[PDB]
Design an enzyme around this catalytic site. Sequence first.
Site, mmCIF file in Angstrom:
data_model
loop_
_atom_site.group_PDB
_atom_site.id
_atom_site.type_symbol
_atom_site.label_atom_id
_atom_site.label_comp_id
_atom_site.label_asym_id
_atom_site.label_seq_id
_atom_site.Cartn_x
_atom_site.Cartn_y
_atom_site.Cartn_z
ATOM 1 N N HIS A 41 56.095 113.538 45.949
ATOM 2 C CA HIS A 41 56.948 113.294 44.654
ATOM 3 C C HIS A 41 56.088 113.936 43.421
ATOM 4 C CE1 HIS A 41 54.661 109.253 44.254
ATOM 5 N NE2 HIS A 41 55.092 109.641 42.879
ATOM 6 N N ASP A 90 56.470 110.825 51.913
ATOM 7 C CA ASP A 90 56.015 111.405 50.723
ATOM 8 C C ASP A 90 54.645 111.888 50.687
ATOM 9 O OD1 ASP A 90 55.970 111.701 47.944
ATOM 10 O OD2 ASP A 90 55.430 109.293 47.688
ATOM 11 N N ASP A 182 47.314 96.136 42.061
ATOM 12 C CA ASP A 182 48.171 97.148 42.458
ATOM 13 C C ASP A 182 47.561 98.733 42.046
ATOM 14 O OD1 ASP A 182 50.426 98.144 43.958
ATOM 15 O OD2 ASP A 182 51.701 97.388 42.395
ATOM 16 N N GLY A 186 50.844 106.195 38.106
ATOM 17 C CA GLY A 186 49.884 107.348 37.499
ATOM 18 C C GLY A 186 48.657 107.605 38.609
ATOM 19 N N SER A 188 49.865 107.641 41.613
ATOM 20 C CA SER A 188 50.478 108.436 42.668
ATOM 21 C C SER A 188 49.671 109.873 43.423
ATOM 22 C CB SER A 188 51.655 109.204 42.293
ATOM 23 O OG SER A 188 52.687 108.221 42.030
ATOM 24 N N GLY A 189 49.660 110.002 44.732
ATOM 25 C CA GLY A 189 48.855 110.933 45.383
ATOM 26 C C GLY A 189 47.471 110.451 45.884
#
Lengths: 250, 55
Positions: A41, A90, A182, A186, A188-189
Amino acid sequence: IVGGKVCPKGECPWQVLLLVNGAQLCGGTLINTIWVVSAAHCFDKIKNWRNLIAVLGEHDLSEHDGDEQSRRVAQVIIPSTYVPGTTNHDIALLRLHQPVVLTDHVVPLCLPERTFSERTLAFVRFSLVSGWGQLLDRGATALELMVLNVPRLMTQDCLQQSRKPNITEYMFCAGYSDGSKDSCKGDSGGPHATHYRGTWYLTGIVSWGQGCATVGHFGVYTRVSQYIEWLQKLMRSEPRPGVLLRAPFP
Amino acid sequence: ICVNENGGCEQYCSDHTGTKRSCRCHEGYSLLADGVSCTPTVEYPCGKIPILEKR
Ligand SMILES: CN1Cc2cc(ccc2S(=O)(=O)C2CC2)NC(=O)CCc2cccc(c2)[C@@H](Nc2ccc3c(N)nccc3c2)C1=O
Ligand SMILES: [Ca+2]
């Protein structure tokens, strides 16, 4: 990352920072000197494929200390089953244009074998998630790399413990439902790294969730063990012209 | 054997025809004579943190 701490410089040496036109895009995980694992994504909105940069040995975004190594991303490989704008499958596999040089500050994370990951790593309760993402929901992103310890849940338990998409066999939940800790958009990945008998392994990818550290919701991570064979076969393949490649999955 | 406590292996485990088990290691590591432990063969093995290892 919400409710974590600064990762002491060099303690997250496999962390990758992905940039597009010099702007923060996503995180990633170095798995050897030329390959990076990130989230599919991360690339949904990319038009400038030639301005995609991976930075290894990064820690503090405000200063260049000489440990950073930048590389152009030569290829972005995404599974055929991934649908842009959705959550399933993903994962992305990135080939660097030139290898990074391993140093005390740049080290790959072990990509485990599938059997070892499913029958052993999947039962290690806590794992670390890291990145330069939001420090708060609707807040600023971090200037220093942040790290957070999160517990993994069985999908039946995640579905039962959550308030108000499906959690597929290609995902897993990890984190807290009390809104305190959490990973964020930002991040992500970025890696979800698991320690076992003195060594760290790649088990998850920061993928999706609701807001950030939202009460009644856990972070959702790509279940890397489902992709081991897919990744290994691509790492043995010759590069193809064009940055983006869609590869058949399984 | 591999299903139970990783067959005693530090890293990877392979089951063989019967009560046989072989432990293996990721690249950049070699298996010790105990048949279970993995020792680095390279300066920067995967999944190890140099500043912590050198401490
Ligand atoms: C909202 N964005 C940005 C985004 C999203 C999507 C495509 C492109 C972008 S982009 O900006 O171009 C990207 C950053 C370069 N795709 C979709 O919307 C579907 C998947 C998805 C669903 C919900 C939330 C997310 C992702 C966010 N990511 C995360 C990741 C982890 C989360 C966590 N652990 N807790 C709470 C929320 C957490 C949220 C997201 O990336
Ligand atoms: Ca820096």
